[PDB]
């Protein structure tokens, strides 16, 4: 019993983190096979960042301008190139700790674990969701760029996020591992803001199922609803529309608890219109939306890696 915000075990990723320094700037890189991946703004001075021309900045750099440290071993850089907003530094040694991995681009509402690192050294791990506005509500300080987010499937690490920057509201923006930004953000020092966010409806439903699995049932009720009627309420409360695919994804939890998705939707509708009336669910006074249906199944059935 119990339900916690649970991250994937991070050992497979820890063995891939390195420190990358270019000039005065130090951040982290991801060492896989014989390539180190890192944010391209490592080549920028603060003055460069106002209107950087990255192609121009990189021309001036040679291989020895990139100092790459794996533990207390300096890696020899033998090539450098740029893919979108990440740099690829070819090194002369393949990482012997390279796990089975792939690069994946996730969708809003999907969750992942963040391995926060400074100076190439892992410092903490936590579970994040990609928000509908494509920010992540991370915990990051200066020097954390190049930290990565990931999921695991059996023995394969799926890398989905590399951290680049912080927005003025204190939320975070980054890229996939091919250097493509999540969200309408650019790696430039200029005015940028996250747009209005919404709540990830299918994840809230998943967490209500987790609550039922754990014995919290006070929000269950005799009513059901329809997708169209529920989505009129969702729109009103700045919740993402529920789709038929979302309903299908919840079906396991739906049968495991004997509560149909549209039955649970009638609970969520009532909670949105009336609140929780002083009560809590799984120790929260807010409706939690950073657990996916698969996160719930994985935790509640003890899936291992």
């Amino acid at each position: 019993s119990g339900f916690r915000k649970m991250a994937f075990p991070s050992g497979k990723v820890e063995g891939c983190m390195v420190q990358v320094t270019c000039g005065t700037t130090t951040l982290n890189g991801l060492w896989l096979d014989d390539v180190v991946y890192c944010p391209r703004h490592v080549i920028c001075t603060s003055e460069d960042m106002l209107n950087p021309n990255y192609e121009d900045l990189l021309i001036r750099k040679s291989n020895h301008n990139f100092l790459v440290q794996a533990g207390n071993v300096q890696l020899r850089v033998i090539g450098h190139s740029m893919q979108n907003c990440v740099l690829k530094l070819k090194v002369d040694t393949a990482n012997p700790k390279t796990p089975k991995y792939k690069f994946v681009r996730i969708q809003p509402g999907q969750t992942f674990s963040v391995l926060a690192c400074y100076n190439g050294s892992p410092s903490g791990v936590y579970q994040c969701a990609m928000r509908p506005n494509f920010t992540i509500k991370g915990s990051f300080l200066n020097g954390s760029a190049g930290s990565v987010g990931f999921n695991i499937d059996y023995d394969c690490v799926s890398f989905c996020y590399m951290h680049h920057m912080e927005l003025p509201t204190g939320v975070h923006a980054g890229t996939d591992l091919e250097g493509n930004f999540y969200g309408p953000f650019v790696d430039r020092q200029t005015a940028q803001a996250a747009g209005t966010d919404t709540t990830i409806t299918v994840n809230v439903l998943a967490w209500l199922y987790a609550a039922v699995i754990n014995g919290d049932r006070w929000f269950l009720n005799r009513f059901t609803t329809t997708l169209n009627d529920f989505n009129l309420v969702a729109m009103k409360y700045n919740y993402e529309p529920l789709t038929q695919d979302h309903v299908d994804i919840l079906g396991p939890l739906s049968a495991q608890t004997g509560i149909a998705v549209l039955d649970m939707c009638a609970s969520l509708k009532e909670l949105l219109q009336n609140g929780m009336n002083g009560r809590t669910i799984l120790g929260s006074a807010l409706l939690e939306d950073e657990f996916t249906p698969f996160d719930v199944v994985r935790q509640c059935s003890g899936v291992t890696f």
């Binding site: 300080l141 200066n142 760029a145 912080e166 430039r188 020092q189 005015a191």
Partner: peptide, 6 residues
């Protein structure tokens, strides 16, 4: 407003 590159 102003971004911070970390």
């Amino acid at each position: 407003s102003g971004v911070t590159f970390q």
